[PDB]
Write a protein that binds this ligand. Structure first.
Ligand SMILES: OC[C@H]1O[C@H](O[C@H]2[C@H](O)[C@@H](O)[C@@H](O[C@H]3[C@H](O)[C@@H](O)[C@@H](O[C@H]4[C@H](O)[C@@H](O)[C@@H](O)O[C@@H]4CO)O[C@@H]3CO)O[C@@H]2CO)[C@H](O)[C@@H](O)[C@@H]1O
Ligand SMILES: OC[C@H]1O[C@H](O[C@H]2[C@H](O)[C@@H](O)[C@@H](O[C@H]3[C@H](O)[C@@H](O)[C@@H](O[C@H]4[C@H](O)[C@@H](O)[C@@H](O)O[C@@H]4CO)O[C@@H]3CO)O[C@@H]2CO)[C@H](O)[C@@H](O)[C@@H]1O
Ligand SMILES: [Mg+2]
Ligand SMILES: [Mg+2]
Ligand SMILES: [Mg+2]
Ligand SMILES: [Mg+2]
Length: 755
């Protein structure tokens, strides 16, 4: 490019920056093409073009002006890229703001979508504010290849679509531009199928939706509603390995954490809305908005010391009682809690406070409701046609046809969408077995094997691997968490090694072992020492997340206190011991709302949590215990740097089944960061109980779960103990400890204490 052209840009004289900025073809070779990307980045000193799906990164060069950049790249197609932009000492990675000159679908958009590879399809499908033929308005487009007709109905034409019939393109997608309407518009698609049957559909790519049970889509100007402040958070994320950091997750169902009064409006970020009543049976109560949750949940979590909040699915879902697991509006956060920008504010404020956001994501199925994706165009469009692979009969839901390109594309782009538009830090997929097996919950003779005669759902396995491949390429540094309950191998291993490509897997066997263990009367735990120790036998086959989830405190399972045997004191003590053990055992941590303050009742998704309990000392003491445990966790590198390496853990001894005692070391990079952990899982205290340690010196008691400030009896070792030169447990030194009742000790060598 010329200096004259560059200056026209720099001085705002150019007639159309899209002619010069963005990606432009320069020439076609035999086997490849030459492209240039140009960007004008005022304040940037350096920039790079990332091609994350090819794993390449090329520098851009300043051309004629220090903030005007060009990058010449040869590759057969340049569909997928990002700009990395350095301003002083900070880097951000963004999509190119000049990537798409037209609001309408181009030939290239349609081709990529037909192949299942349009990672940004939601920029074109759905509803977008833009300009066509010189007039402002909204462009709508929808995939519905077998429909006979489609119209746009909405507020703007009183729900009569005769003058807003859409145009079909390439026998696949319907489009229409409507002038002079804007964001806030309420609409649906009216579809006639091949039988002449007419019906009404929410927008599958819609960005906002009426409050359930109403289902019309709402047009959102999604790139001009919120201003973010989280660049430094996102840079740190992208440059860090989360597997090596503390990850302590507070799992939250937004609709049931805290309720407000329905006798007042729901406040929003700079606005307000009508209250959303929680249920007709509890009509005095309303949900809190994303905005109110940002103001209340976030400081609560920050003070407790968790690193992350994990949300039960917030994608739009018609029924409270599915807990979010039956989604019908995959591209919009639920309007129960307000608008898209209020959720963006929640995430921004999490990042301002140093807290990451993980979203439960539901790609495994969708329910039958007629406003949603089912039988979309008068054929089995989203779902597979054969019910033996296309329905989960025991659940009454439909299963995506992962093999069908535009369906795969809906889902792959949907995951990316949450990271792009809402800046989230991770996803968790519930029930991964439900996608992986062709015989999932199906009786003999009511499913068919794959082409090699196996039970593996080939198409789903491929989809899962593609999702995880793309997620990590576009958003390095994120968490991708699976719950898979059949010992499928290499869940949390890279795709290049025959894995599914998640980075963490819930240790459901650990969870069962531990909760089954603690539910046993302590005298009988001597017969089940193996519950304590067994999970370490297979631990290194995955990267495990130790989760005590929502699923474990419903349906007659009790809340954590009620699972524990004995009187009120021992119930609390058993909670403290279990969770101190969980936080010291290798792996990342997740626990569910209400567990941190000892709610007695099961989680009830129709009410809010029993916050009045926090008026009372035992509940306040447990909450302090977790606050301090989380603080320790973040303070001690041996609790997080080497979770997934042999170095990070070693048993000291696990043979004393008769007293239900175990002990172990955690390690990090510095040998002085080593910790000794001692667990006593009955209410019998022990005096002069020896434990082997590897070095001489004074071992400080960093943490004692029996401290009086946590509700314990305050037995302990008075702050620490000097090791004896008395060999024990095959180690040259040993500590002669008092073991408090139903309690866990964490000790650390202070190699500078004065003898
Ligand atoms: O300090 C004197 C005693 O210290 C040691 O006793 C221990 C017990 O061994 C531990 O098990 C624990 O005791 C718990 C007890 O397990 C639990 O049931 C509960 O017992 C209370 C009960 O809540 C209450 O309603 C009433 O019956 O009083 C009981 C009081 O003992 O709470 C206990 C802790 O308060 O903790 C104490 C350690 O302090 C040592 O073993 C004893 O020999 C010695 O007497
Ligand atoms: O009477 C008071 C006694 O207190 C002290 O004994 C303690 C030890 O200090 C503890 O470490 C523990 O002993 C465990 C031991 O840690 C555990 O390994 C297991 O030992 C097995 C051993 O693993 C196996 O190799 C085989 O050797 O036999 C051993 C004995 O079973 O079980 C031990 C407990 O049974 O608890 C005891 C108290 O019970 C103090 O050191 C003693 O001198 C004192 O008598
Ligand atoms: Mg009509
Ligand atoms: Mg399950
Ligand atoms: Mg058993
Ligand atoms: Mg309540």
């Amino acid at each position: 490019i010329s200096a004259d052209q560059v200056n026209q840009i720099i001085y705002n004289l150019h007639h159309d920056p899209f002619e010069i900025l963005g990606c432009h073809l320069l020439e076609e070779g035999k086997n490849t093409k030459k492209w240039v990307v140009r960007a004008y980045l005022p304040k940037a000193e350096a920039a790079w073009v990332i091609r994350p799906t090819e794993r390449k990164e090329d520098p851009m060069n300043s051309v004629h002006h220090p903030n005007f950049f060009e990058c010449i790249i040869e590759t057969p197609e340049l569909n997928h890229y990002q700009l990395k932009v350095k301003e002083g000492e900070h880097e951000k990675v963004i999509y190119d703001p000049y990537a798409f000159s037209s609001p309408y679908l181009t030939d290239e958009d349609i081709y990529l979508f037909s192949e299942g590879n349009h990672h940004r399809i939601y920029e074109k499908l759905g509803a977008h504010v833009g300009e066509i033929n010189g007039v402002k308005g909204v462009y709508f487009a929808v995939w519905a290849p077998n429909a006979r007709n489609v119209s746009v109905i909405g507020d703007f034409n009183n729900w009569d679509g005769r003058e807003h019939q859409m145009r079909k393109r390439n026998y696949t997608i319907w489009e229409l531009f409507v002038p002079e309407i804007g964001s806030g518009t309420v609409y649906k698609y009216e579809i006639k199928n091949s039988e002449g049957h007419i019906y009404e559909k929410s927008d599958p790519y819609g960005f906002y939706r009426e409050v359930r049970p109403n289902t019309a889509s709402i047009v959102v100007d999604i790139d001009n509603i919120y201003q973010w402040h989280d660049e430094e958070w996102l840079e740190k994320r992208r440059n860090s390995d989360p597997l090596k950091q503390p990850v302590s997750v507070y799992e939250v169902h937004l609709g049931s954490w805290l309720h407000g009064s329905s006798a007042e409006k729901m406040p929003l970020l700079n606005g307000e809305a009508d209250p959303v009543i929680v249920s007709e049976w509890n009509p005095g109560a309303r949900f809190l908005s994303y905005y109110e949750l940002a103001e209340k949940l976030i400081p609560y979590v920050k003070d407790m010391g968790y690193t992350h909040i994990e949300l039960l699915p917030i994608a739009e879902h018609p029924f409270d009682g599915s807990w979010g697991y039956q989604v019908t509006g995959f591209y919009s956060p639920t309007s129960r809690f307000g608008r898209p920008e209020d959720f963006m504010y929640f995430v921004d404020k999490c990042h301002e406070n140093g807290i990451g956001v993980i979203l439960d994501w539901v790609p495994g199925h969708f329910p039958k409701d007629s406003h949603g994706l089912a039988y979309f165009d008068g054929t089995h469009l989203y779902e597979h046609a054969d019910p033996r692979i296309g329905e989960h009969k025991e659940w009454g839901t439909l299963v995506f046809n992962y093999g069908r390109h535009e369906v795969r594309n809906f889902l792959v782009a949907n995951v990316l969408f949450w990271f792009d538009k809402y800046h989230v830090d991770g996803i968790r997929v519930d029930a991964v077995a439900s996608m992986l097996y062709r015989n999932y919950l199906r009786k003999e003779g009511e499913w068919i094997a794959n082409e090699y005669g196996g039970d593996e759902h080939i198409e789903a396995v491929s989809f899962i691997r593609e999702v995880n491949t793309l997620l990590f390429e576009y958003f390095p540094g994120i968490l991708s968490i699976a719950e898979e309950s059949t010992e499928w191998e290499k869940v949390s291993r890279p795709v290049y090694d025959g894995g599914l490509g998640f980075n963490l897997k819930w240790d459901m066997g650990w969870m069962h072992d531990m909760l089954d263990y603690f539910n046993i009367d302590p005298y009988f735990r001597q017969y089940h020492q193996n519950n304590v120790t067994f999970s370490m036998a297979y631990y290194y086959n995955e990267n495990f997340m130790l989760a005590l989830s929502h699923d474990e405190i419903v349906h007659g399972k009790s809340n954590m206190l009620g699972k524990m045997p004995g009187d009120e004191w021992q119930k609390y003590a058993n909670v403290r011991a279990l969770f101190t053990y969980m936080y010291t055992h290798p792996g990342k941590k997740t626990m569910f709302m209400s567990m941190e303050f000892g709610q007695w009742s099961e989680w009830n998704v129709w009410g809010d949590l029993e916050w009045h309990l926090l008026q009372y000392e035992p509940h306040q003491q447990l909450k302090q215990f977790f606050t301090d445990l989380n603080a320790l966790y973040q303070q001690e590198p041996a609790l997080y740097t080497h979770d997934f390496e042999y170095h990070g853990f070693e048993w000291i001894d696990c043979n004393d089944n008769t007293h239900s005692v175990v002990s172990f070391l955690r390690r990090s990079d510095d040998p002085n960061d080593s910790l000794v952990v001692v667990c006593n899982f009955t209410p019998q205290p022990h005096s002069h109980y020896r434990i082997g340690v590897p070095e001489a010196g004074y071992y400080v008691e960093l943490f004692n779960s029996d401290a009086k400030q946590y509700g314990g009896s305050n037995m302990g070792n008075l702050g620490g103990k000097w090791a004896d030169e008395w060999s024990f447990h095959n180690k040259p030194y040993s500590l002669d400890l008092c073991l408090p009742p139903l309690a866990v000790l964490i000790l650390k060598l202070d190699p500078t204490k004065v003898p």
